[PDB]
Amino acid sequence: KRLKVVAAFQQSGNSPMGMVLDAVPVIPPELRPMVQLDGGRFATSDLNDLYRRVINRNNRLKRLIDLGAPEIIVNNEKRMLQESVDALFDNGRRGRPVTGPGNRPLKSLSDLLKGKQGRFRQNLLGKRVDYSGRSVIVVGPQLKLHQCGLPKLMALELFKPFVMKRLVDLNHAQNIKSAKRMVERQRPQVWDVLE
Amino acid sequence: QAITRAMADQARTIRIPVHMVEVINKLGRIQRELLQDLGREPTPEELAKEMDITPEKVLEIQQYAREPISLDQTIEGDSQLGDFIEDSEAVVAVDAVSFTLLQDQLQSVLDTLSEREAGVVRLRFGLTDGQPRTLDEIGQVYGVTRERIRQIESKTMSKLRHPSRSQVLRDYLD
Amino acid sequence: WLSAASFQETTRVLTDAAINCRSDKLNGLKENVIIGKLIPAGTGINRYR
Amino acid sequence: DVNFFDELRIGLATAEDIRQWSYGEVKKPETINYRTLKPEKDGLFCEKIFGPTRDWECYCGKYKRVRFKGIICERCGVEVTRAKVRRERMGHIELA
Amino acid sequence: SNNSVPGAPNRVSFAKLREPLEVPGLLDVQTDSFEWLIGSPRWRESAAERGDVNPVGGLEEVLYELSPIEDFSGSMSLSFSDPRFDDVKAPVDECKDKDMTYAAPLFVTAEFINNNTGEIKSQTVFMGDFPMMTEKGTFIINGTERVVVSQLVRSPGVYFDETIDKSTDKTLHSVKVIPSRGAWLEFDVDKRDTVGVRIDRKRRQPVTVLLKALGWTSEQIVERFGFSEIMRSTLEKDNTVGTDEALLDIYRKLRPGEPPTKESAQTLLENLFFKEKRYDLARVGRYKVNKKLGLHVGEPITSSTLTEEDVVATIEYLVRLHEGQTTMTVPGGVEVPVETDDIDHFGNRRLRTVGELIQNQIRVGMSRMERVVRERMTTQDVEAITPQTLINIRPVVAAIKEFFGTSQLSQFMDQNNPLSGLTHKRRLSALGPGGLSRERAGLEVRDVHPSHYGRMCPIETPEGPNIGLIGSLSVYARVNPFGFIETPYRKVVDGVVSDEIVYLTADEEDRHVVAQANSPIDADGRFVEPRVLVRRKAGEVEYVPSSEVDYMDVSPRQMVSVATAMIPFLEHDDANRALMGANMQRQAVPLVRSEAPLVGTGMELRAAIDAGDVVVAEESGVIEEVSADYITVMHDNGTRRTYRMRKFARSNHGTCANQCPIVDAGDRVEAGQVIADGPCTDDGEMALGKNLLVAIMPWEGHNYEDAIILSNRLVEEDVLTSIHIEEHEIDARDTKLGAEEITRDIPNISDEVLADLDERGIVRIGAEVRDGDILVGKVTPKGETELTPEERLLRAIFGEKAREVRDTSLKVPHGESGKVIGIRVFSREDEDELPAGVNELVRVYVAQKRKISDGDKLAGRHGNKGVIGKILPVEDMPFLADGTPVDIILNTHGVPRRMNIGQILETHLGWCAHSGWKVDAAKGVPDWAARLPDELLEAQPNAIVSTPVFDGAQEAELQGLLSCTLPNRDGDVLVDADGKAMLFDGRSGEPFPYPVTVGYMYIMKLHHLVDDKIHARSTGPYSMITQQPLGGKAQFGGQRFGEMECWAMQAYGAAYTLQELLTIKSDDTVGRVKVYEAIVKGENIPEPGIPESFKVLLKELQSLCLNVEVLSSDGAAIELREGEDE
DNA sequence: CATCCGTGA
DNA sequence: TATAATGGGAGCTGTCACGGATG
C-alpha cells in the first residue's frame, strides 16, 4: 500500500513537495459573491469568512514573528493558521467544524463538490433548462396516442420567440420589441398565430 | 486595549472604522439606559436627541450595525438562499437581440446618406471608434477642413427625417 | 476521474487522481455530458453524425 | 473557443503554480467599504486584482469609457475589460 | 341529539348514550400552557382546583433558580421577585395591520443586597416587551399569525436496556443516565461478568473504581453488592486500590493533558455530577429517577441534582436485573418493579408545551445577562451599584425575539380552513432543537406505540419523509404539570360504572386494567357478561372476569384526533386511505358560501367553535343591532358588547376569511352561542365541502385512474367556487443616484396603460388587473453611464432627450388576475414609521373569483382524492328518472382496492338523508331498527344526522333505511333497497343496462389548483454563479432536467437533444442568446459552445491547488476565453 | 473473520 | 495605558450498512 503512494510520485516528475503549501490560491469573487438584498441587508458566501479567517491569522503571524515573540505564542499562531487553512479546504474534517451565526457549519471549498448538493451531482449531471414548464395532468380519451393537450397559456410562453417571429412576419407588429409586447398583453391575434 | 481594538477591527465582515464602532456601542448603551426608564423600546427620535441630537444618522447607524447573513445558509431537501438570488448582471436574450436589429437599421442609414454625410455621423457619435471626438478635432482630422464637417451635419439631420418618416426608427423608441 | 468523482466519495477520488497525474480522455457518457460534448452513443457517434 | 479538445489532465499544484495563476496577493481581510460600498484595495474584492466592477470602468474613475481597452490606469492599476473577468481571475495569499 | 349544549342545529345521532364528559377545550393545549408561563389568575385557580400544593409560575420559577446572584466574595447579592405585566401596547388587529408584535411589557422587582455595607437598594426594572398569546391560541410576530408547536422529547431520567450479545448469546444489561443538561453517565454489563462505566463517552473502566473514588470502603463494596458473583468478580479484577489511586485513575482517563492534583481530581468529580452549575436533572429529571428507584418518593421536589445515593441505588438496580431478579427495595425506599425500560413509552417520552419552550429560551437569556451582571459587579464601586447599572436586558429581549423568528418552534399559522388552524395549533413533533433530526430517526420512533391510545392519534401523520415524527393530540387528552400526557377513564368500583373520572398517565395505566368503551352496561352501572374485553400493559389483550375490572374507556372515539373523528364510518376504511382522509381535510378551501354535510359525526360543531374563526357570544342577551359590518349585543345587566365582522380578509395562505352574521336583529341569544360564523362554517359547524349527488360508475373513460367528472351545475351555481386574495408589495428606497419615487409618469408608456391609475401612480380600487399590467408606478434614477452611440444617434434623429429614470414599476405577476379590492400606503412623510431607507411603501390587494375547472384537486373524507378530468354540460350528465342530473361521477374501479368503502356507506346514508325516511311501525317496531333510537324512526327531506366513529350506523340499519326512502314530489321512489337506481345516458338517451349506485357524498375543494400549479418559461432570469436558469414559479424559472432524466435521454440515444438541454438551453452564456436570434430570424440553430458551469468547476479546482489543464490533440494547454498572467 | 472512523442513503 | 488582577466551557444525545485499517 505504501508503494502505491511512493510509486506515483516517482513516475511523472510530480513533486511530493506540493502536499505542503507556501501560498494558497483564492477563488474568483463572483464565485464567492457578495450581494445586497432588497431588505438592505447583505448576503455573502461562506468562503469570504474563511478566507478572512486565514488572512487575519496569517498577518498576525507576521506581526508576532517580527516582534520577536516567544515560541509559545508564535507556535500557537502557527497552529491556528493550520486549522484555518484546513477549515477552508475541508471544514469538519479534523475536529469540530467552524460555526457561523446560529451554530451552523460553514460551507468549505470541498463542500461545494460533495454528494448530492455538490457541484457534480447537482449542477453537471442534471441542470435546469429554459423553454420548459409544468402543470397538472388530466385524462383525455379523445386524443390519439401521438397527441397531448397543451394549455393555450403554457404554449404561448413556450413558443414565445417563435410567435414573436411570425408576428413581425405578418406585420401585426412592426418589430421584435413590439411583438414582445403583443404576446405579454395577450392580444387576440396571437391565438391564431400560435396555432 | 489591544483586544477591544482588534475586536472592533476584525469582527466586522465589512470593516467599519474605530470611531464608528464607538458610536454603535454608545447607541446600545443609551438605549439600554432609556430602556429601563420608559418601560418600552425608545423611538428613533428619542434616542437621537439624547446623544447626537440628529435623528437621520441614528437610522443610518442602526443599519451599519446590521450583521450580514450567509448565502450558503438554508431554510426542505436543500434550501440554499443563493439559489434564489437573481443574477442582475447576465444579459437579457430579447433585449440583446433587439439592439442588434437596431444595428441593421443604422446600416440602412449609412447608405442613403452620402460618404461625407455618413462620415461625421460615425465621427462625433463614435460607432466604430467608441469615443466621441471634439468637433474642432474632427473637422481637422478629416481631410476636409473649414469645419465643413459641421456643415455636412445639417446636410444629414433632415436626410435622417426620411427614415424617420418611414417610421422604421419610430418603432424602436416606444 | 471525472466519471468517478461525479459518482461517490468525491474527496477521495480527487486526492488520488491529483497525485497519480491521471489524464482523462473525455470519451464516455458521464464524461461527455459534463463538458457539454455530444454523448458517444446513438446519434452522437461520427458514423451517424 | 472550439469545443473539441482531446484530454483533461489533473495534477498536484506546485506552490509556484499558484503564483503563476494569481494576478496579485490579497493582503487585507476587508471585503468592501462601509460607506462607498466599493471593493476596497488589496482586499478580497480588490479591483486591481480581480477586475472592474462595471464594464470598462476603472476604480478611481479616471477611465470610464469603452474606448480604453487593455489600458492599465496609473492611479490604481485596474485593467479595463468587462466584469466578466471576476469569474476567471485568481488570487493568492502568501503564508509566512 | 348529540351536543345539546350551546344552542346548535339538531343533529340526530345513531348512538349508545354518551354521558361521560363533553369534549374538553380543544385549544387548551396552548392556552393552559401559556397561562402557566405568566402565572395568570385562571391558572392559580386551576392549580387550586387540581389541588396543586404551592404553585410556581413559569416566570416565577426562572427567577428562583437564578436568585440570588452573588460573586465569589459573597459581598454583593442580586435577586429578583414579583413579575408583573402592563396592558398590551396595541390591540391584535392593529398589530396585524402595522406589522408589529402583539406584546405586553414585563416588569420585575430587583434588589441589590450587600453583606458588607448591610444596605439594600430595591427598585423596579423594565425587562422588555413580552409576546402575548391571543384567545385563538396563537402569537403575532411582525404582523403574521404564528403558532408554537409542542415538542416530543426524551424525558430525563435513568433508563435500562437489555441488549443481546452476538457472540456469547447471553443477555447483557445496559443503563444510561440522562440529565436535563450536563455530562453523561452510563453503566453497562460485559459478557465477561464485569461491570463498567462510561463517563461522557470515555473508555470503559471497572465500576469499583468509581465506588472507591466516592469514598466507599473496599469492605462496604463486599457488603452491598455481595449477593452477586458478578460484582465479586469485578472488585477482584479491580486493578488498583485506594481512595487517592481511584480519583487519580478516573482523572487520568477523563482529562489527559492536565496535572493531576489530589485536590483537582476530587474537585471535578463533585462538579460534573453533584453541582447545580454543571449538572442538572429537571423537576421531571429528579421525579423520573425517583420513581424508577423509589427513594424519597413522598418527599416534595426540592433536589435538582444527582446524589451518591442515586449512583449506588442505580448500580444495585443493574446487577439484580442482570441475574434475573424481578423486584427490589432500595434501603430507605419503597419497593419498585425491576425491568428494562422502553424509550418510546409515553411515561418515558415527554411532551414539552409552549410554556416550557418559551421558558427554556428565557432561561437561556437570563444566563447571558447573569454573566454580564457578574462582570458589572467587579468593575463598578460598591457604593454606586444599583440594579439599573447591573442589569442589561439586551440579551433577554434578543433571546425571546430570536426564538419566535429564529427557531423552528414557531410554525407558521396554516390558514387553510377553520380546521387547518385547529389541527395546526396542536401538533406533536419530535423534530426541533433538543429533539431528533430526520436522518437520526429509525423505524421504531415512527410507528404506532400501545401507549398512544387516547393520548396521541395513530392515524393522523404526514405521508412524506416526516411520517411518524409528526402527529396530532387525541381529543380527550390533556397535559399534566410534568409534561406527560394524561387521558380520561371512567372509574369502576366493583363491576359498577361510576361517573367519577380520573386522568391517568401512560405508565400508571399499565399497572391497572381497562375495559373497552362499548362494553354493555346495566342501566344502574353494572356489566352484562362476567368476562369482558380488557386492555393490558404492553398492548396485550385478554378476557377478564368482571371482579377484576378497574377502569373503562370514556368514549369509543377516545383514541382518535380531532380531524380523525370527523371521518364518518372510519372503521370501514383502511388506515392507509383513512390517513390521507385526515390529512386532506386540512387542505380544504373556503368556498363562496358553505353548506354543512348531510352526513356528520357530531365533531363538526365543537371543532367550529373551538377554532376561534367563528363569532361566539360572550354574555347572554338580545341582538340590539345587526349589519354586514358588525353585531351589537344588549346584555342583561345593561352593558353592550359589539362584535366586528372580519370581512374579505386575506389569510396566511391567500384563502378568503369572510364572516357573516347568523342571527337576525332581535333574536334572544344565550352565552356560548355562535352568532356569526366564518369561512367553511354553516350554522356553527365545520363546513369543509358540499353535498354532491354522486354516481358510482365508469363513464366514457373520463374518470379513468382516479380522475373526476363534474356537472356544469357546479360552475353555473358556484357550488365549488372560491375566492383567493393576494398581497402585492413594493417600496421606494434611497439610492446613490437619488431616490426612488412613486409617480404616474413612467418612461415610454401610453396613457392607455396608465388609464387605471390615480394621480399618485397607484391603481384605483375596484379596477381590473391582468398579468403584465401596472399596479404601482415607480421609477428610479439609472446610473449616468454612456448611452449607446447607436442609441445616441437614434435620439438625435427624433430629437427626444433621454430621461435618467428607469422603469421599476410593480407589474402583475404571470398568471395572477382579478379585481383590486384595497390599497394600503405607508409614507415616511405621513410619519408612518418605516425601515431605514424607505420612503413610500404600497400594498395593493387583489382577489380572484376562481370557479372550479379542469385539474383542480377534489376529495372526500375517506382518502378518495383525484383531479377534475372533465366538466360536461348539465345535459350530458347521467340522470335519474325524474330528470335530475347527478353532480359528480366517480369511477367504480378505484374503490375496493383502497378498502375505503366508507365512502360507499356515506353514499347510502347520504341518500336516505336527502329523501327522508320512515320506519314501519305497524305490526310493531321492526327487529333491525330495534337498536335505533326513537328520534330517527322518522326523518324529513334534507335531514342532518351523526355517525360517531366506532358508533353510529351499522350495516343492518343502513340496508333497512334504504327501503324506507321517501318518494319524490311525483310520488315515486328513486332508489331501491340495494341503494342503486336506474340512470339514463344523457348522450345517447338510452337507459344504462344495469342499476347504478346513486346517493349524496360530501366533497371538499382542496388547495391544489391548476391556476397556481401551471407554469412555463421560454427565457428568463439566470443563476448568478452557475449561469444556469433560476428555479421556481415565483422566480419564473425553468424545470430541472436531473441526473435521472439524463439517463433516459442517454438510453434513447438522443445526443443532440441531451446536448442542447445542457448547453444552449442552459448555461451557455453566448449560446442561448444566439439561439433566441436564430429562432426569431427563422434560421437554423447554431452549434453549442462550452457550458459556463464547466468553466466554474475548472476554476474551483484551481482554487484548491489542483493544476487542471485542457489539452488539444497535440498536447498543448489551450485557453478558455481567458489567459494566465503572473 | 470481527471493531472504529468517515461517507454516503 | 501604573491599586491588583494570572489554566475554558459547552457538551448532545433515537441510525444504518459497508469497506479498510487493526485485532
Ligand SMILES: CO[C@H]1CCO[C@@]2(C)Oc3c(C)c(O)c4c(O)c(c5c(c4c3C2=O)NC2(CCN(CC(C)C)CC2)N5)NC(=O)[C@H](C)CCC[C@H](C)[C@H](O)[C@@H](C)[C@@H](O)[C@@H](C)[C@H](OC(=O)c2ccccc2)[C@@H]1C
Ligand atoms: C419554520 O417551519 C418550517 C419547518 C422547518 O424545518 C424542518 C426541518 O423542521 C420541521 C418541523 C419542526 C415540523 O414540525 C415540520 C412539519 O410539521 C411539516 C413539514 C416540515 C417540517 C419541518 C422541517 O422541514 N417540512 C415539510 C415542509 C416542505 N418540505 C416539502 C417539499 C417536498 C415541498 C417537506 C416537509 N413539511 N408538515 C407535516 O408533516 C404535516 C403533515 C402537515 C403540514 C402542516 C402545515 C402545512 C404547516 O404547519 C405550515 C402551515 C407551516 O408551519 C410550515 C410550512 C413551516 O413553514 C413556515 O411556517 C414558513 C413560514 C414563513 C415562510 C416560509 C415557511 C415549516 C414547517
Ligand SMILES: [Zn+2]
Ligand atoms: Zn484609475
